[PDB]
Design a binder for this molecule. Structure first.
Ligand SMILES: N=C(N)N1CCC[C@@H](C[C@@H](C=O)NC(=O)CN2CCC[C@H](NS(=O)(=O)Cc3ccccc3)C2=O)C1
Ligand SMILES: [Ca+2]
Length: 223
């Protein structure tokens, strides 16, 4: 996260870390057995880390759980990043408490201007690379579809939204992918892609979770 602040330990109880011997993506807990993340974070060997603040120190409150399976959206397109969503089933059910809790799915899409909380352990630099130990947070509005499309003409599908600041200085960055975008208590977005980090007129692009609620529900029911 570039331009954000320290969240505070366990204040984003639905944030997960995907680990393969290092932190490579984020994700959100949506029930005791399932995490949502981005299709592009897809790899074998994933250990889901819940209740993490400092990802380098065991502090207490962590639960380390192997993914049992990862489900990339069948229509995911790695050139376009259209349908950039993935579900991960935990080998066993997390223990839900105040530190480790699930985020609700929206029942309707958010409008332009809604303020959301984005969070991750990704690079905190616009230029160069500086990874934090602790979770960082950012408040960012959802931009209008007109602005989003005039920033990335021919690249925005109806399953993507833009959020952030046209002025540069504040954004998600390398490391943050798969992580939540939460707006009024629901998960509206997934960190997906952009152009550099916190560059002027190049806001971050997010997966539009409201378009996937049925798919999520349907796939979880059958697995
Ligand atoms: N919000 C941004 N400005 N982003 C752009 C820079 C980093 C991104 C997180 C990352 C995963 O952690 N997503 C990307 O790597 C997805 N993707 C892959 C291909 C190239 C494309 N653009 S470039 O890396 O900035 C991209 O965003 C999001
Ligand atoms: Ca830790």
């Amino acid at each position: 996260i570039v331009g954000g602040y320290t969240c505070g330990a366990n204040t984003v109880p639905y944030q997960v870390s995907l680990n393969s011997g290092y932190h490579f993506c984020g994700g959100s807990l949506i029930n005791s057995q399932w995490v949502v993340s981005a299709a592009h974070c897809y790899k074998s060997g994933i250990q889901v880390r819940l209740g993490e603040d400092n990802i380098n120190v065991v502090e207490g409150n962590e639960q380390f759980i192997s993914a049992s399976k990862s489900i990339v959206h069948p229509s995911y397109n790695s050139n376009t990043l259209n349908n950039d969503i993935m579900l991960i089933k935990l080998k066993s059910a997390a223990s839900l408490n105040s530190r480790v809790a699930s985020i609700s799915l929206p029942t309707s899409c958010a409008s332009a201007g809604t303020q959301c909380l984005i969070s991750g352990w990704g690079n905190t630099k616009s230029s160069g690379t500086s990874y934090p130990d602790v979770l960082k947070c950012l408040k960012a509005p959802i931009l209008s579809d007109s602005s989003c499309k005039s920033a990335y003409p021919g690249q925005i599908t109806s399953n993507m939204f833009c959020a952030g600041y046209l002025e540069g200085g504040k954004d998600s960055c390398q490391g943050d992918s798969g992580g939540p975008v939460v707006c009024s208590g629901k998960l509206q977005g997934i960190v997906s892609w952009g152009s550099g980090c916190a560059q002027k007129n190049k806001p971050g692009v997010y997966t539009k979770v409201c378009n996937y609620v049925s798919w999520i529900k349907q796939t979880i029911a059958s697995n």
